[PDB]
Design a protein around this ligand. Sequence first.
Ligand SMILES: [Zn+2]
Ligand SMILES: [Zn+2]
Ligand SMILES: [Zn+2]
Ligand SMILES: [Zn+2]
Ligand SMILES: [Zn+2]
Ligand SMILES: [Zn+2]
Ligand SMILES: [Zn+2]
Lengths: 405, 405, 405, 139
Amino acid sequence: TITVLQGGNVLDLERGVLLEHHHVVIDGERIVEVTDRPVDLPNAQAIDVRGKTVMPGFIDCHVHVLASNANLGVNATQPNILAAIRSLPILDAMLSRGFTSVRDAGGADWSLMQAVETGLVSGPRIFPSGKALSQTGGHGDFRPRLEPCSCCFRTGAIARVVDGVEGVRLAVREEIQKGATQIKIMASGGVASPTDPIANTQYSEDEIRAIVDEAEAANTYVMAHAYTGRAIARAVRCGVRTIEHGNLVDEAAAKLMHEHGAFVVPTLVTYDALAKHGAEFGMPPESVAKVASVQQKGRESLEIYANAGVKMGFGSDLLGEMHAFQSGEFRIRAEVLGNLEALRSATTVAAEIVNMQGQLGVIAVGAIADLVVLDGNPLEDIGVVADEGARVEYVLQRGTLVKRQ
Amino acid sequence: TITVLQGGNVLDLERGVLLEHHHVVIDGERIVEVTDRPVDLPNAQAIDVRGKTVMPGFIDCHVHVLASNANLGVNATQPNILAAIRSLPILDAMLSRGFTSVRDAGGADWSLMQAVETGLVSGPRIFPSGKALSQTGGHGDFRPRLEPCSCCFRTGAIARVVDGVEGVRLAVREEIQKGATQIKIMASGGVASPTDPIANTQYSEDEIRAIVDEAEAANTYVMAHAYTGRAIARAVRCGVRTIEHGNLVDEAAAKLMHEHGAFVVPTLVTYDALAKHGAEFGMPPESVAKVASVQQKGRESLEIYANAGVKMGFGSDLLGEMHAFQSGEFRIRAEVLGNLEALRSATTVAAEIVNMQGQLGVIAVGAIADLVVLDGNPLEDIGVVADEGARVEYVLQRGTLVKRQ
Amino acid sequence: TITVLQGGNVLDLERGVLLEHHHVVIDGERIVEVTDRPVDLPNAQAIDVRGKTVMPGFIDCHVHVLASNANLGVNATQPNILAAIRSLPILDAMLSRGFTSVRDAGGADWSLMQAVETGLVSGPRIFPSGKALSQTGGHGDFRPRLEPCSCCFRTGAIARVVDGVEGVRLAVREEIQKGATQIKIMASGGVASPTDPIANTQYSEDEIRAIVDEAEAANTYVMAHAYTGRAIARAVRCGVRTIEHGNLVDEAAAKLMHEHGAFVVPTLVTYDALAKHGAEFGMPPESVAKVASVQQKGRESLEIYANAGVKMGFGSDLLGEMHAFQSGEFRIRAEVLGNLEALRSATTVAAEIVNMQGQLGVIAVGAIADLVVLDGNPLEDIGVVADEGARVEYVLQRGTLVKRQ
Amino acid sequence: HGDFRPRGLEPCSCCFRTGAIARVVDGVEGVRLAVREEIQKGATQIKIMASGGVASPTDPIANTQYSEDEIRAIVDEAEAANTYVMAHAYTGRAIARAVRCGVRTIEHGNLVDEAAAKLMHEHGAFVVPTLVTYDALAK
Ligand SMILES: [Zn+2]
Ligand SMILES: [Zn+2]
Ligand SMILES: [Zn+2]
Ligand SMILES: [Zn+2]
Ligand SMILES: [Zn+2]
Ligand SMILES: [Zn+2]
Ligand SMILES: [Zn+2]
């Protein structure tokens, strides 16, 4: 059968206007009609959406669903079944904030992706990376300042450690076999790892090139964690498609990104959260030392990306109980670029990042019915979205209604 | 001693005509005379071939002699001595259908080649690949969507999983030591494997280039499994000599193939069989999902190959009890290319592929005595050879008579 | 349906007489009636057996079906599929000689057993030992007088080398998981192995005990290869059930064997064969040095076992092309004990050895229809059995007729 | 009864799948180590298979599993950690020896004779029949 959201103000994002009193008609999992007709509803579930905004369900392009606590070291060493359990609330809470799809950046696997798709578990559709690739002593290596690691994969582990061209090549083939949808690598130092300062680069160009080739071979792409313009530039020229964080770009690297057609997924909200509640939520004292420097240029970088004409996706990257602040990223972006853009990042641009242009992030005929129904107009008050589930009262996923609030 | 097939109509393939009441004289294992003389037979076994077509014994360029059931996963896991035993009827039946030589595309080894050649076992001469080479998660990787290890060689295993330039180099040197005649790899997604969609490529160009080198070093070639024009172009540029299946060529790839002097071996019959009796004969349900798409472009591709002028060999690639349909490939090709071509693909073109030009696939002086005697004329009715056999009453192999029907 | 052997002279073994003009009625796989009635055959396959001896099909308690050549060293190293192929002739010949069941003493596995039971392959029912257990440098170690060795089970290998209590324990649990029906161990030096003189013992009492226990825990027994009275005595005290060869007993050991209720399976024909054609058929020169001694006391031992009242079963132990000599063991035993006793060793006593008392080795109601039809009377001329398959013209196996000669 | 490998074979197995009911270990030291491992990981008691069963491929229910040395080593290591061993067993034969080796509770136990029962009462051993499962597996 068939469902009609009636009399909503449909958000159309490429023109940037509400379309008032437009009905939208769902058959099965897909949108069949968007019109301001009196519509011919014989056996349709009518949900009355008068004076309320209906827009495409949001896409978060950088989450760690399995990051149930803020020390990613100790997250990795928690027992498997507990690691899994603890992700469930995280998933549920994402969905009710309006997020109908997430690109998980290391941790989530194909089993979790199936769990939501078969209905076994409530949450967003996951686009899994499997495990992030990290070189030894890299952003994914959580060993404190002897070595030989570890036979087999803990379900709590964000990353795996692999070095060498043949090593990475294999690892990518293994991850794609295990059903990843894209490949995440760490291509610079970070904040949450013990031994790497943020300014230095990770992986040789030979390794990154091998990885990008093996991903392309399986008709997907590489996403890459990378802060400085030096770290970004190399990664992009090796052929990576999306850059994660990217807090310390220069315009030279920004220009190179635009030119190559590479995307960026800023994750500003995680730095504010780790500012307030950093050493407080159990993340090592010398990791909170590293967080002071990246949030500075963080806001500033957004302008640079916008100036160069680089597409920016929505990303949170929140760990542990800081997971609640997910929606706040809308606000931060709205402050710097217009809140049309802030919304675009979680919809149209996001949908392109995950290769579902036309499929998600748009209310149009043929598209998947992933809808959010919003009390108020985000186009003028960004707060209706950025206030943590406050003002979202319906969530639709693949046709079916999943939240009523 | 010495043998005479008297008064036959000898099929000459490069001219495309029967030569009536030509006698053919066999001494030892070789053809010594083809003539329409009254011939001078003192102590020759006269076999009377009046009004019946005598042609070269057929060559099949793609078989899996050891594929005794349609689930190649379970075929691989079956006990060694049982895998061996169950290939015996397969071999026998192939010979009875007129196939005096087969190129096995993964599975059969040098021991099976020996068993026929010393007469310990009835079948076609085998040109063994040993085991096909497959990357991890490739068309030869039969592990479900874990990641164990393995690595003793099951005698029912079609392929082996090897990654990396050195890995593949070693693998080819091993396969050639055990006495492979040519090297098979998987360069693309496939149908009969769990985790690889058909549209993606397999192996880096370094790996394939390595492989081709090690093959050429032992004075033989590589046969590569590939479907799409993208997969085929890259393989051909790396220097593979024969392409298997090739159902989804564009003409740009076919042009390249012709240019490089590469062959194709289409296997159209297997898809028809897997259409009818796919899930029925125990091949996993999501493999029969993938069979729908490749048989479409299958017949079309034949034209593409013929237009670009790419030599086409005969291949069956039938698994399990679907082995019976082997000869039906003649019909399929005849229907697109006329039956002179269809006969050429299993004789003159085939013999060139297995580097036996002038040794097999031609009735001429000095050639090996691999002869089929046919009741009817295949030049006008393709049915006389494409009918389970039915109409083949003599098969000669290296001089001696092996089937009387 | 149903079958009748009519008017035969049924051999009854416990009373030791022919029963003339007794009909035997087979339904399915079982014997339903043995009677000298005019029998009421409506739709029965009548096979006319007037004036011919019908007796139970023979059981040979010690064969090596996989021993396709006389050098067990080189037999083990032959390629897997070739090892399998070569056993097919061997099995077929055994069946034609009247043997409807064989107890394989290392080499044959469950899959071969299945091959015959499912009728994939013609031959006797097999009771597989899997692989003989042998200590390092023991009768099953074929390494020249060094080390590394071997990860994987060659299908042509008679034995495996395992040492120590936990080692042999695991070895037995494995062999039974793979579906051995009983367990073979080497408990002494032998003839066909490079490094062990026949006089000395093999395995500790601890190992043998552990082995016997694990056998008994799986509701089967241990068969043990042992020559000297010292080697025999110890094995029997450890609770092994049958003794293979046994050529150099003293009566003290024999007495203990009787006391414990342990059988013996002498294999005298193999030493005569190795006398004539030893170094001739490719068995290493210092192995044929060892064969001189054992045949001496061989005929003499038979008396000792008889005197002590130790049950004897039928055994050949023939290797390679010397397999042909299988039935000659009848004549050899008939020469020393009566030819009644010689037929008993292949029937009633043999069926007890393989735990099939009342199931095989007797023509009686409810027993399995494993029958041989014999031209002449073996109770007076032992040559009607011991002339290979000269004088056996019907063989019935599990109801159905398998040889017509 | 814990070994779910088909009658091949004999490869494989590296790590612990969280959906696995059992592990395969053989030998006196092997079991000893496995018990210590299991207790370190936080088991409250130790479960063993001392008999053939129903839900496993290769073992007929009539026959026994583990040597008395193995079982008794298992019981000791469990007692050293102030717990007990529970043991899966059907027949009176398989039951008796388990109890003689000092296992505290017997699982299923569908095929006792009063001989084994009497021995069980004497040693102070419990039984946990699971009759419902066989009705369910019947339908
Ligand atoms: Zn990152
Ligand atoms: Zn991250
Ligand atoms: Zn293929
Ligand atoms: Zn193939
Ligand atoms: Zn022996
Ligand atoms: Zn033997
Ligand atoms: Zn149980």
